[PDB]
Symmetry: C3
Subunit: 341 residues, 3 copies
């Protein structure tokens, strides 16, 4: 958010952050929610907007993740990746259109509870149809309903097939949409998407069906120094899962997902957080029902100003030791310090 050019109708911001970060869990964290050890990383990105005329804007964004917890040896690149890369046009009262790597439209809903100091947002998987960042997506968005209805918003998204070398990262063609309304510091949102699955996905031992589906609804209140939000969603053939015992992977035939969060902002900078998150797989081959995620969160971010914060995030993991997929059951606490610009 450092504007490095603003002339001839063009404005570009370089942005990024350096995050010193450590995770603490029992042992070496192998059976924990979050893992153990150094988790330091940095982000870099640009975001630019050109005012083409008084009625039309063009824009672009790119965002990279650089892990800062690898050695300078052969593992140096582990977890480095492009998060976002897209370009688009915005025509006043008609809408915007962009194409590239961007957030799936179901995240329009899941974004409501994705507000924890470190963790949270567990169902917003990357490269997973409509719930997270995904490649090859064309997105149309409309604010205030062509200007006719203040606060009412909608979006329509086409997902292009990505035939990759893993089932986990692949998808077929799909289409999704979202609608929201925002009022006096409140919002309500619903979003839905459906897509073909690829042959490689259908071939996995877990999950069965030609189509993947995801939807979510969300409600939030954001004002008076208080933030409250809830999401409920369900998926079919879309949430990736691994049975740690049988070394087998694929997609959950169904999941039912709930996330709740409550936060308070003190004027002196401290922002306590609590939350609850549960994701339950159903009809899993050879298992039936089984929790994927189940925890309470207690944490806090201390904002010094717009550029600097520290935080702690504690996950009280309610997953138990006999979880049938072998999901980790131990707690994790993150401690972090962030410089951002």
């Amino acid at each position: 958010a450092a504007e490095i050019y603003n002339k001839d109708g063009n404005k570009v911001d370089l942005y990024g952050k350096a995050v010193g970060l450590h995770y603490f869990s029992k042992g070496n964290g192998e059976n924990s929610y979050g893992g153990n050890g150094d988790m330091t990383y940095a982000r870099l990105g640009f975001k630019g907007e050109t005012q083409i005329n008084s009625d039309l804007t063009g824009y672009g964004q790119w965002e990279y993740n650089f892990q800062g917890n690898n050695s300078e040896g052969a593992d140096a690149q582990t977890g480095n990746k492009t998060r976002l890369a897209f370009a688009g046009l915005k025509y006043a009262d008609v809408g915007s259109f962009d194409y590239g790597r961007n957030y799936g439209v179901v995240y329009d809903a899941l974004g409501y509870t994705d507000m924890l100091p470190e963790f949270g947002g567990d169902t917003a998987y990357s490269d997973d149809f409509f719930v997270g960042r995904v490649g090859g997506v064309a997105t149309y968005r409309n604010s205030n309903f062509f200007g006719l209805v203040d606060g009412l918003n909608f979006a329509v998204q086409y997902l292009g097939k990505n035939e990759r070398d893993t089932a986990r990262r692949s998808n077929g063609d799909g289409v999704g949409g979202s609608i929201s309304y925002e009022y006096e510091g409140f919002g309500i949102v619903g979003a839905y998407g459906a897509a073909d699955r690829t042959n490689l996905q259908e071939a996995q031992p877990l999950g069965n069906g030609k189509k993947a589906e995801q939807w979510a609804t969300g409600l939030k209140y954001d004002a008076n120094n208080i933030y409250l939000a809830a999401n409920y969603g369900e998926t079919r053939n879309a949430t990736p899962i691994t049975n740690k015992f049988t070394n087998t992977s694929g997609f959950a035939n169904k999941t039912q997902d709930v996330l709740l969060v409550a936060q308070y902002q003190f004027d002196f900078g401290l922002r306590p957080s609590i939350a609850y998150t549960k994701s339950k797989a159903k009809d899993v081959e050879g298992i039936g029902d089984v929790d994927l995620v189940n925890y309470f969160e207690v944490g806090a971010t201390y904002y010094f100003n717009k550029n600097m914060s520290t935080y702690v995030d504690y996950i009280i993991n309610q997953i138990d030791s006999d979880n049938k997929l072998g999901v980790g059951s131990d707690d994790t606490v993150a401690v972090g310090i962030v410089y951002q610009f």
Copy 2:
């Protein structure tokens, strides 16, 4: 975008985000361009410092970040440094730079490398003098010691790069170019020759101690019209693969022709037509065979200097009985570009 300009130093950060999709028959396996999402971003810096009235120092770096991978194990596929060099420019005498930079024969091939998405097929990366290449020292003289506007020449020394593939390797070499541009007209010639490495000589396709590349070009660039043509030949330098025997190496000879015609409408549309043909000769076991053969029709629509969209359509004249197995199917690209 100018991010610094103080105490005689000027540095610009630049880049672009390109939303991009290719459409080809089926999975694109037998096509010119492939199929599917091809989105990417570029980031680079370019800087120049005033040392004294006669001398400026400069540096440039440019990276490609693919935007069409997942965030999993494949996340890095096709990520790479395109350019990385630093140099000194002595007024009325010339410039010297060293690093990863364009090969000098690209001084010619740049004339036709102007299509919305495709084109420039013979300017291979890491291929002696015709594209981007590492370990290259380049001397340039713009405007001929200051005496003649538009008259340029260059001499380039290529350092040996013994890499673990023949495709990406090269021995020591030397190359040069000369160009002259006057009132929208332009003519250029370029040639380079270099030793080949042991590993390159070991491949079953291609035989010779030296690689050579040369190309000439003519252009007309004015009155909103752009016309250009390149002709070139190579010896032991164009990489090829026989997909039927799974053998590879370099074409003993190629003869290459590229033509482009474009028109710029004031309202923003720039249509394009082109023709490209690269023919290999003396290929072991085969004789003559086409590597590239197509007509192009395309258009870029310029909103302004920072925003455009485009379509590029490759009408592939290659056919199904091509002796090397070159893809025969057409490809269409559609793109939207934000750049700064």
Copy 3:
């Protein structure tokens, strides 16, 4: 650094360099000090600092290495890596604290002789406990002794365990510190650190012990355009080594290290250099004592201005062709041209 932002209490600089670089050694450089061939690279980084209140600033830095001597094929990313990524807080007259990937505290001493145009600094290994850049380190620093004594500094550093997939890049938990006094051209510094070795490091055939130790002292004279410095250090179980003959790796049970440098700065920009570096491993399994580094250096950098330089650096290698670890015995000369901002 190029200032891309300065307002509302926050200043951020983007910085970087492009380095055209070529090494010349006998043959293809396999038996040489430095190697042979193109070595061009670029650096990009950001560094930021925000004034939070009268006594407190927050800061962050990230720095990346992009190799420029690879092809655009499969080897394109070879040697790309994050060098630095950390964030911190600086409390006036009280000290600074940062966490992330940063210099080990023994480098507080080794920096004294790490001044050659291209080479030198041979004992400042990356990912090597306290002597170079390392991940997961928490560092407290105090400049000018709580504001009471100009030129008196100290630091205390905590190293978090990094259990990696190679012994070379791993470490256990550790602690070190440094102290320096720099009065009017003269400087003296001492630094020491110790840490647990991991099971994986213990399992290597070279090196035996539960703990790694490193310490070093430095003396410098930096004034009147003259730069003179000496470093002396010892290590236990901490310097990584490979026996190229037996093709086994691990750590030196002991090393004793000496680095010497002498430089002169002409006002017109030329800066000649001569140096000496010797590092000897002792009690090495199947060998006894063996030289790791042993050379004389002659070189020069020509500084055109703050943004541009060229250099030549020649390493006259004293290592013997019958070195028992197989250390390369051939000389290397580097020639570089650097644009930086």
